[PDB]
Ligand binder design. Structure first.
Ligand SMILES: C=CC1=C(C)/C(=C/c2[nH]c(/C=C3N=C(/C=C4\NC(=O)C(C)=C4C=C)C(C)=C\3CCC(=O)O)c(CCC(=O)O)c2C)NC1=O
Ligand SMILES: C=CC1=C(C)/C(=C/c2[nH]c(/C=C3N=C(/C=C4\NC(=O)C(C)=C4C=C)C(C)=C\3CCC(=O)O)c(CCC(=O)O)c2C)NC1=O
Ligand SMILES: C=CC1=C(C)/C(=C/c2[nH]c(/C=C3N=C(/C=C4\NC(=O)C(C)=C4C=C)C(C)=C\3CCC(=O)O)c(CCC(=O)O)c2C)NC1=O
Ligand SMILES: C=CC1=C(C)/C(=C/c2[nH]c(/C=C3N=C(/C=C4\NC(=O)C(C)=C4C=C)C(C)=C\3CCC(=O)O)c(CCC(=O)O)c2C)NC1=O
Lengths: 169, 169, 169, 169
């Protein structure tokens, strides 16, 4: 199910989060089933913004081979909680985006949850600075997710194959 | 699906909504599939509150024959929009509850929607002051729902059979 | 003034806050200057409600001798943070109400703050189960307030004189 | 004062608001007394952003001759209400910004309001594509404001004198 029992959890986020080091390209390695990703090879690119926060450009490769993308803006509405962001994507209502853990140069774990009464809808992603990530790191991040009730066996492994994804350039 | 494409619609609500005439017992006649109703024979009872708004007591009959209930509070956070309520149920995050149409003495149409990025999760109910409602009224209210994109063929018809539901008293 | 520089602070709230023990009558002992209290002898009475949360009845004695009162409802929108309440007063927009500290039987310190861009508007009150409170307790609670930036120097001392407030009954 | 009785009004906003035509430089002509503008010669510059919405750069000239400025991002959280924006200024909490009326090439009237219980704090500004605006336009826009309860009598007339504001360049 996309909708799960219980209200949203409140996991810990990355201490001393530094958005400048978080900028650049991230590859989707695993993610919870969701409605927005329609393809494979997903990347997120975060870039400087003349205003506050940073800009967002997400791209994926659809089955027909076309590259589909969305633009957005990311802002931490409380400057004292810089890892707790609101993402504003074109044609979407705002969604939360929490950086739960990152070392900036290899991996990040991101989490988002919206309450639906006594249920909730959550999204989570393990991302990497490369199209792959070591199994040891994946299992560690999955452990973090399990610790607050995420169904890790539901995680999808994103296709990042070099040939299949060549159209991403 | 419980989660549907598009952001929440903004249907018109009942003009000149009068919560005092809305109080009392309502029977669930049809509703969109949802996660909270686990049984049949559902009723909603709205009662006076010493504070602002009104109090909520929802009851249903589970398959095992036990009656399960929840208490809540209903408040219109903007007094100038009295038909646009927030419902606060025990152990639940707040949810919207809009009275789209009612004649107070026979039927009401209620709607609730929460945005999930570019998707949404909606709930809707046709309720009656009696365990049944005339087909003509049902079709009229379904027409209202269709006019803003609700999938009316997905509506569930609640079992309100006198014998099956006798445990509701 | 009423609006001061900086965003609202997030002070710690009462651990294991038990609303049931918080019910009953409280006397205003000191409070920050505000727009709603126009007289003296202020009291807050919190009572059981059939729904969630509790009901609110605040009364004060105006300079002309008239007793003025308001009703409201109090609800903790996040059940896991029971001391962080939203108060809904008749014809008012919702306002936050945080129980920072209480021993239920003698005193409580309440705090509320709303952001106004790079400024904020804050309210705070020391209340007592009696019309007076020990000077030692008061100094203790003022210490808490000044610890997160409240200007305790601006606190008003509420007239609770038994003769002046006799109209309160 | 800055805080006045009653909840925020909901004035009508500019129909078919086109952010692209709203970009560029605006001069503050009149504004309600507020906490953020500490000088004169105020200007707002709105620019393209790679993400959603637009970027904000506000500048003014303090009495000591120093130019003070702030950066921010503007986003319409509901794409169907493009004139109802949220402004995120550096180190400030989010604030509403509603374009009530503009012809893009000459004037705009902006409004913002935040509820404080049964009171409110409002901001409003008349801006112009030039350092001055025709008296007729000004009276027109004041009429709009007074029509929903703004105290136009309290409006400050911003010093845009070319010599006094020369440091703005
Ligand atoms: C996103 C929207 C959304 C809404 C609107 C919603 C309402 C809501 N209905 C609830 C229970 C309930 N609600 C009902 C019945 C009704 N409820 C009604 O709103 C009406 C009109 C009827 C009947 C006429 C009953 C019978 C229960 C108790 C369910 C049970 O405990 O078995 C609960 C309690 C939590 C739970 O048991 O899951 C919530 C939060 N929840 C949501 O996520
Ligand atoms: C309830 C939570 C919730 C979240 C978090 C959410 C994010 C989000 N991701 C989007 C697109 C996208 N998002 C991604 C990828 C990513 N996105 C990421 O947050 C990360 C970490 C990656 C990859 C590493 C891509 C590739 C698209 C474009 C999808 C497409 O247009 O095909 C959109 C655009 C609207 C849409 O296309 O449906 C939203 C709102 N939506 C939600 O409802
Ligand atoms: C920004 C924060 C903020 C808060 C917290 C707030 C509370 C609040 N207190 C109110 C009335 C009142 N409140 C009080 C007293 C109390 N109230 C208390 O919270 C406590 C602890 C006491 C006393 C112990 C009384 C006596 C009234 C009625 C005042 C009157 O009608 O004369 C009202 C009614 C609207 C009004 O008359 O202005 C609100 C919204 N308003 C705000 O804007
Ligand atoms: C409750 C409502 C509310 C609003 C709208 C608001 C806007 C706002 N304007 C700001 C600065 C500023 N805003 C302006 C000017 C403008 N600003 C405008 O919205 C327009 C139309 C002009 C001029 C045409 C300038 C010049 C600064 C920098 C002030 C300075 O740093 O000295 C800031 C920075 C924080 C601060 O310095 O206080 C905020 C939050 N703040 C609020 O509390």
């Amino acid at each position: 199910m996309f909708i799960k029992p219980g209200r949203c959890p409140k996991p810990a986020v990355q201490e001393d989060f530094d958005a400048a080091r978080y900028l650049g390209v991230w590859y989707d390695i695993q993610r919870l089933p969701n409605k927005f990703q329609k393809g494979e090879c997903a990347t997120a690119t975060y870039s400087l913004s003349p205003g506050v926060g940073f800009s967002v450009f997400n791209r994926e490769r659809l089955a027909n081979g076309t590259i589909k993308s969305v633009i957005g803006s990311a802002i931490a509405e409380d400057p004292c909680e810089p890892a707790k962001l609101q993402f504003f994507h074109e044609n979407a209502a705002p969604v939360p985006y929490w950086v739960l853990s990152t070392d900036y140069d290899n991996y990040a774990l991101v989490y988002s949850c919206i309450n639906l009464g006594a249920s909730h809808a959550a999204y989570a992603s393990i991302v990497s600075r490369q199209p792959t990530l070591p199994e040891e790191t994946i299992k560690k991040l999955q452990g973090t997710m399990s610790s607050f009730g995420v169904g890790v066996d539901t995680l999808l492994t994103t296709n990042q194959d070099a040939a299949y994804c060549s159209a991403m350039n």
